[PDB]
Amino acid sequence: HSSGLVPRGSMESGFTSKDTYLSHFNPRDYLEKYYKFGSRHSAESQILKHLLKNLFKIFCLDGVKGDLLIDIGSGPTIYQLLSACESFKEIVVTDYSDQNLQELEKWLKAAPAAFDWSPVVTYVCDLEGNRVKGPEKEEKLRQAVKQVLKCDVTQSQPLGAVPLPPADCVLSTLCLDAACPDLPTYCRALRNLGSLLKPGGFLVIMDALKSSYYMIGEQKFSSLPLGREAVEAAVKEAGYTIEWFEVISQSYSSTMANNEGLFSLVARKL
Numbered sequence: 283h284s285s286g287l288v289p290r291g292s293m294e295s296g297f298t299s300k301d302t303y304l305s306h307f308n309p310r311d312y313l314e315k316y317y318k319f320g321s322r323h324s325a326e327s328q329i330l331k332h333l334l335k336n337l338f339k340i341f342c343l344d345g346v347k348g349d350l351l352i353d354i355g356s357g358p359t360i361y362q363l364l365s366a367c368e369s370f371k372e373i374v375v376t377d378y379s380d381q382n383l384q385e386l387e388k389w390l391k392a393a394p395a396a397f398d399w400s401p402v403v404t405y406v407c408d409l410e411g412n413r414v415k416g417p418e419k420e421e422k423l424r425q426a427v428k429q430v431l432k433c434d435v436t437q438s439q440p441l442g443a444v445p446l447p448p449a450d451c452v453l454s455t456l457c458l459d460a461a462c463p464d465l466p467t468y469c470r471a472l473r474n475l476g477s478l479l480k481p482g483g484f485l486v487i488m489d490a491l492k493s494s495y496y497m498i499g500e501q502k503f504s505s506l507p508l509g510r511e512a513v514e515a516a517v518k519e520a521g522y523t524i525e526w527f528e529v530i531s532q533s534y535s536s537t538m539a540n541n542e543g544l545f546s547l548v549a550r551k552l
């Protein structure tokens with residue numbers, strides 16, 4: 283190990299190897315650190331609230347809706363699906379980490395040991411006009427998630443041989459920066475994601491800007507430090523047209539990530 287001198291699993295290649303996500307990425311430590319939502323005025327909670335409003339705006343105010351949505355790099359989180367659940371009949375959650383998928387399946391089973399998303403759920407229910415309350419919202423999402431799949435964005439077939447309909451939308455929050463060691467892999471990963479999408483289908487990405495790493499407690503993982511111009515260039519080259527692109531100044535605490543804000547985009551496959 284490098285003891286923080288360099289991200290974990292990065293000493294040789296310069297970027298966290300994916301094996302590291304099967305060894306040192308602890309979903310409970312990640313959820314505890316980033317999605318606790320116990321104090322709203324934290325840097326973490328401020329970021330999450332902005333992500334939720336955008337996902338709410340994308341799926342419930344805009345037209346982004348359809349039959350199948352595939353979430354790419356879900357990790358152990360479900361916040362990114364609460365609003366999409368209202369406009370998509372079927373949701374497929376995917377990640378590279380088996381530990382993350384296990385943590386997800388625990389929440390889908392509503393196991394008592396699963397993570398408590400209750401305050402995040404309540405926030406989304408208030409965004410959507412309080413038509414329902416927390417427990418009813420959670421159950422609607424639990425029924426929408428039809429598949430929990432292994433995923434690798436660096437592969438031509440990110441979901442392997444699992445057959446799926448062409449999706450109406452592909453969603454990916456906070457994953458591509460962590461998964462792609464360079465800009466060519468990033469652009470190819472966006473092309474790989476397009477293999478799951480209908481022509482003219484929607485692509486929704488939210489990720490950090492200009493971040494070289496993120497922390498889970500004392501564990502450092504690599505992130506690809508993209509600027510807005512680089513993201514825009516990679517999205518267009520991968521075969522999409524951008525519908526809207528938003529950049530926010532809000533950052534994670536320097537103790538958790540070295541990002542300079544976040545971006546949010548909706549694109550369509552040309």
Ligand SMILES: NC(=O)c1cccc(CCCN(CC[C@H](N)C(=O)O)C[C@H]2O[C@H](n3cnc4c(N)ncnc43)[C@H](O)[C@@H]2O)c1
Pocket residue numbers: 300303354355356357358359362377378379382433434435436454455456457459460461462490493494495496505506534539540541
């Ligand atoms: N970049 C930063 O600064 C920054 C800022 C804040 C937080 C973070 C950590 C993000 C952790 N998850 C996001 C989970 C969820 N969507 C969510 O929103 O939190 C990344 C997930 O994707 C990883 N992954 C790595 N290789 C992957 C591959 N080949 N295929 C698919 N997945 C891959 C892991 O599996 C993670 O589960 C980074």
